């Protein structure tokens, strides 16, 4: 069974729109979103659909690009580091749950490489 997806809004959370945050959405996320390996990360893991019932028994801090996209679109973050942290959590979760020689890990590693490439050009 799946937990509630991570929050994309929090009225009592302090928010702020920075040039770095705009770049993370308009450039970083938008480009990664269109990558041939991006589709498994565009929405939370469905432990039932994927026959991975133990996923949310192992991953206690889930994250996906769909959540990050909504957070960016909702101006949920205070600075770029908060958004970058969500990306790092998404990748880390994948490497934790899956075996190093798995297709999904190869997809994550490719996206992580492109992600690191793009944040090295952060404004
Ligand atoms: C991301 C993630 N992190 O842990 C798991 C598990 C996933 C995942 C998410 C999906 O939406 C689909 C699949 C699976 O169907 C697949 C996808 C691609 C290659 N080989 C297998 C895996």
Numbering used by the authors: 43 to 165
Pull verbatim passages from the article behind this deposition.
BRD4, together with BRD2, BRD3 and BRDT, comprise the BET family of bromodomain-containing proteins, which function as readers of acetyl lysine (KAc) residues on histones and other proteins. Using the bromodomain-containing protein BRD4 as an example, we employed a structure-based approach to identify the L94C mutation in the first bromodomain of BRD4 [BRD4(1)] as having a minimal effect on BRD4(1) function. In this work, we describe a new methodology, “mutate and conjugate”, that combines site-directed mutagenesis and the use of covalent inhibitors to rapidly identify selective small molecule ligands for a protein of interest.
The L94 residue, which is conserved across the BET family, is part of the ZA loop and is located above the 5-position methyl group of the OXFBD04 isoxazole. This placement suggests that attachment of a 5-position electrophile could locate the L94C cysteine and the electrophile proximal, allowing them to react. Simulations, performed over a 50 ns time scale showed that the calculated RMSD values for both BRD4(1)WT and BRD4(1)L94C were comparable with deviations stable and remaining below 2.5 Å for BRD4(1)L94C after equilibrium had been reached. This result suggested that the L94C mutation would not significantly disrupt the stability or structure of the protein. We therefore produced BRD4(1)L94C, which was obtained in high yields and purified to homogeneity using immobilized metal affinity chromatography (IMAC) and size exclusion chromatography (SEC). Both BRD4(1)L94C and BRD4(1)WT had the same melting temperature of 49 °C, determined using differential scanning fluorimetry (DSF), suggesting that the protein stability had not been compromised by the mutation. While there is some small variation in the ZA loop where the mutation is located (backbone alignment variation of 0.41 Å RMSD for the full protein), OXFBD04 (3) retains the key interactions with N140 and Y97 of BRD4(1)L94C. The position of OXFBD04 (3) when bound to BRD4(1)L94C suggested that attachment of the electrophile at the 5-position of the dimethylisoxazole ring would locate the electrophile and C94 close in space. Increasing concentrations of OXFBD04 (3) also led to decreased levels of BRD4(1)L94C labeling by 42. These results are consistent with both compounds residing in the KAc binding pocket and covalently labeling BRD4(1)L94C.
